Structure 1
Amino acid sequence: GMTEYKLVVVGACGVGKSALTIQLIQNHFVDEYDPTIEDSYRKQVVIDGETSLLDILDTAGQEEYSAMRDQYMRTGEGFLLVFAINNTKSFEDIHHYREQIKRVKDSEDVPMVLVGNKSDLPSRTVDTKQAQDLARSYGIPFIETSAKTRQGVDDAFYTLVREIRKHKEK
Structure 2
Amino acid sequence: MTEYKLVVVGACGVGKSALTIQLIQNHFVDEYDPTIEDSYRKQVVIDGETCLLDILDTAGQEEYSAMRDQYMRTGEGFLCVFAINNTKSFEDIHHYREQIKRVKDSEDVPMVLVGNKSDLPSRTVESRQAQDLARSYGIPFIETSAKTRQGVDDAFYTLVREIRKHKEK
Inter-CA distance 18–28: structure 2 relative to 1 (3 Å threshold): farther
Cα offset, 1:25, TM superposition: 0.4
Inter-CA distance 55–134: structure 2 relative to 1 (3 Å threshold): same
Q: Deviations over 1:112-158 (max 9, x none)?
A: 11101016757111122211110000000111101110000000000
Inter-CA distance 33–122: structure 2 relative to 1 (3 Å threshold): farther
- What is the TM-score normalised by the length of structure 2? 0.85
Cα offset, 1:49, TM superposition: 1.2
What does residue 131 of structure 2 align with?
A: 132
Cα offset, 1:98, TM superposition: 0.7
- Unmatched 5+ residue regions in structure 2? none
Q: How many residues align?
A: 169
User: What CA distance in whole angstroms lies between the structure 1 residues aligned with 2:161 and 2:5?
Assistant: 13
Cα offset, 1:60, TM superposition: 2.6
Q: 2:7–2:75: 8 Å Cα contact kept in structure 1? A: yes
Q: 1:116–1:145: 8 Å Cα contact kept in structure 2? A: yes
Cα offset, 1:107, TM superposition: 3.1
Q: 1:22–1:29: 8 Å Cα contact kept in structure 2? A: no
User: What CA distance in whole angstroms lies between the structure 2 residues aligned with 1:167 and 1:48?
Assistant: 16
> Which range moves more in the overlay, 135-144 or 112-121?
112-121
Q: 2:23–2:152: 8 Å Cα contact kept in structure 1? A: yes
- Three-state SS of the structure 2 residue aligned to 1:145 is strand
Cα offset, 1:63, TM superposition: 6.2
Question: Which ranges of 4 or more aligned residues in structure 1 deviate by more than 4 Å?
Answer: 28-40, 61-72, 119-122
User: What CA distance in whole angstroms lies between the structure 1 residues aligned with 2:33 and 2:4?
Assistant: 25
Q: 2:12–2:60: 8 Å Cα contact kept in structure 1? A: no
Inter-CA distance 66–10: structure 2 relative to 1 (3 Å threshold): closer
Q: Deviations over 1:38-86 (max 9, x none)?
A: 9971101111111111010002355684999755522411100100001
- What is the TM-score normalised by the length of structure 1? 0.84
CA RMSD of aligned residues (A): 3.6
- Three-state SS of the structure 1 residue aligned to 2:4 is strand
Inter-CA distance 41–118: structure 2 relative to 1 (3 Å threshold): same
Cα offset, 1:162, TM superposition: 0.4
Inter-CA distance 112–105: structure 2 relative to 1 (3 Å threshold): same
User: What CA distance in whole angstroms lies between the structure 1 residues aligned with 2:133 and 2:98?
Assistant: 14
